[PDB]
Design a protein around this ligand. Structure first.
Ligand code: NAP
Ligand code: NAP
Ligand code: CS2
Ligand code: CS2
Lengths: 309, 309
């Protein structure tokens, strides 16, 4: 299934994220994911694997595995390129070997010191604090995103990690409304108010970190993984589905788009196999009690600034 | 003691906040405060007591208790007036019986449905959710705030409850940089990153809720008051000062402006008597341990939207 964006284009509700994929394995993983049925792929300039992603799509086309118009390809403008939107998008297209993108997102409501087109970096000052750019407004960046649509380079444009305040602001100054807000949300960070605000104004929600980040975010950020929660194990036993599949199905039934990442082809197939069962209202109501309002993914340590302060 | 704003004007580091002051008591409390030595007063249109504040100040001037030029008067633009900035400012001036304001703040990075000049309100829809405005950008509101300086109605302009992302944005689009960001901060919500960021770009920090809200915010918001903390008990015994005085002195030594509210004249005296001692480096490091990153004041219930979601 798929959600129709306010741009008119349909966006598959289950995609594959490629952050932290082993760069020597992305080609095999993406070709295997496409073969299994994945059509939506979530990329980013600052994941620094767009080239390998592009090689995978090219081989999938060359071997008749899929056609370009059957894929929904997202990438993202990094913080260091808020003043170079046209060049950054064209560079993403070059690395991905694509003529157009289905979706292009402002990765964060943060601009930092430009580090060169094709070479995105979060530059720290000599005190270990992000060199924040205080010259380029989010609105100025957005009006350049709007030109990408007018030039035919991007079908739909949107935002990532915008809260209620920033989303209200872009709704006020945009000429083309954002099609998507990609935010962290999962059973421990359910964020009902922000999802409901975005939906009220026709903005679709993509749930990044849709599993809660599992072991990867426990190690990297110290977050608690929801996947061994007793609520999910009861539902897992009842539906004969894994806790991860319960969580992804839950995200789908909340009318969100979910983009789990796995480096294991066995889990690629598992995460995609969530359309042969359903969660009841009571099941959904149980998962609601899991809410902790606890963010897992924060760039505070990497940037030397707690942007959520 | 005062901080020199980037506008050139001096703003006293201790002021009196008037939110939740009963209208039958404000005028006596303000005249008491002025007699004690208070010169900085934090008001807002939406506190619904500007008229009584102006009456107190008028009597203070008419009886030669103080002169207007030695007072620092702040008031704030309510969310309902982001599209009526100049008219809302002139209305505040008329209720306060002033020719100019020392400081005028955007109260929140939120615009909601207009409710009339001099009659600010947070209009809710039939489901209890704020009627959010999505036509007036924060930048548009700021450029009207900048006119108030040129018109001589306002000496210094600023913002309130802007986080790192919103502060970076206004630093980008402003022509007159904000002089003040008035944010919640106190020993249980120290927000080092946001204060550091604002200070880096010459924005003064006013700490609202500087005591942590005490018992009033426990009742209204469910927060834990820091005034019973074992650390402040030991520092109180050390300095023969109250936990509250310790907390306010801590705010001053963080180079912030602190605006505690009390409805009790003895506490008015107590809160102003914080310039006769100093906290040692070790004292401030002990207060640093109290950090729990826990916001007390939130409009979530009033607006039916968790804006911090
Ligand atoms: N816009 C943003 O700021 C932002 C932020 C964060 C993430 N994202 C995007 O969202 C995507 C997903 O987020 P994420 O990768 O951070 O976290 P996630 O998808 O919530 O979880 C990924 C972790 O879960 C494990 N996992 C995956 N499938 C599993 C299954 N069926 N059973 C058990 N464990 C499983 C993975 O391990 P294995 O790989 O070993 O299988 C990996 O460690 C990213 O790849 C990225 O595209 C965007
Ligand atoms: N911009 C914004 O969004 C925003 C938000 C919140 C507050 N503000 C401003 O900041 C001001 C201060 O914030 P606030 O009033 O909410 O909270 P606060 O000043 O941190 O604390 C006020 C509470 O502390 C008590 N108190 C005062 N002095 C005391 C002492 N020496 N010992 C023990 N308790 C004491 C008061 O009780 P009694 O009155 O009974 O003495 C009152 O209940 C407000 O008045 C308002 O002007 C602005
Ligand atoms: O997955 C994401 O988009 C986020 O986690 C980014 O902050 C990401 O960590 C950076 O682009 C990595 O450099
Ligand atoms: O003190 C403040 O400025 C805040 O607490 C406001 O949210 C306040 O609660 C409202 O303006 C009161 O109507």
């Amino acid at each position: 299934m798929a959600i129709t964006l306010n741009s008119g284009f349909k966006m598959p509700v289950l995609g594959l994220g490629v952050w932290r994929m082993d760069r020597n394995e992305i080609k095999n993983l993406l070709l295997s994911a496409i073969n299994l049925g994945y059509r939506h792929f979530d990329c980013a300039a600052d994941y620094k694997n767009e080239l390998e992603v592009g090689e995978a799509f090219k081989e999938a086309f060359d071997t008749d595995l899929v056609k370009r118009e059957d894929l929904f390809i997202t990438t993202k403008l990094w913080n260091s390129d808020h003043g170079h939107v046209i060049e950054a998008c064209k560079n993403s297209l070059k690395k991905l070997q694509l003529e157009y993108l289905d979706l292009y997102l402002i990765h964060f409501p943060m601009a930092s010191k430009h580090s060169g087109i094709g070479t995105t970096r979060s530059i720290l000052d000599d005190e270990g604090v992000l060199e924040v750019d205080t010259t380029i407004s989010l609105e100025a960046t957005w009006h350049e995103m709007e030109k990408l649509v007018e030039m035919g380079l991007v079908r739909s444009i949107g935002i990532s990690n915008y809260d209620v305040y920033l989303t209200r602001d872009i709704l006020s100054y945009s000429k083309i409304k954002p099609a998507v807000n990609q935010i962290e949300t999962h059973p421990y960070f359910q964020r009902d108010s922000l999802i409901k605000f975005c939906h009220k104004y026709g903005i679709a929600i993509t749930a990044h970190t849709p599993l809660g980040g599992a072991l990867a975010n426990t190690e990297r950020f110290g977050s608690v993984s929801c996947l061994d929660d007793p609520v999910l194990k009861k539902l897992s036993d009842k539906h004969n589905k894994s806790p991860a599949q319960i969580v992804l199905r839950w995200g789908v039934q909340r009318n969100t788009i979910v983009i789990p990442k796995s480096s294991k082809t066995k889990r690629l197939e598992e995460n995609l196999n969530i359309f042969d069962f359903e969660l009841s209202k009571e099941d959904m109501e149980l998962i609601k009690t899991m809410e902790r309002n606890q963010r897992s993914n924060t760039p505070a340590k990497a940037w030397g600034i707690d942007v959520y302060a």
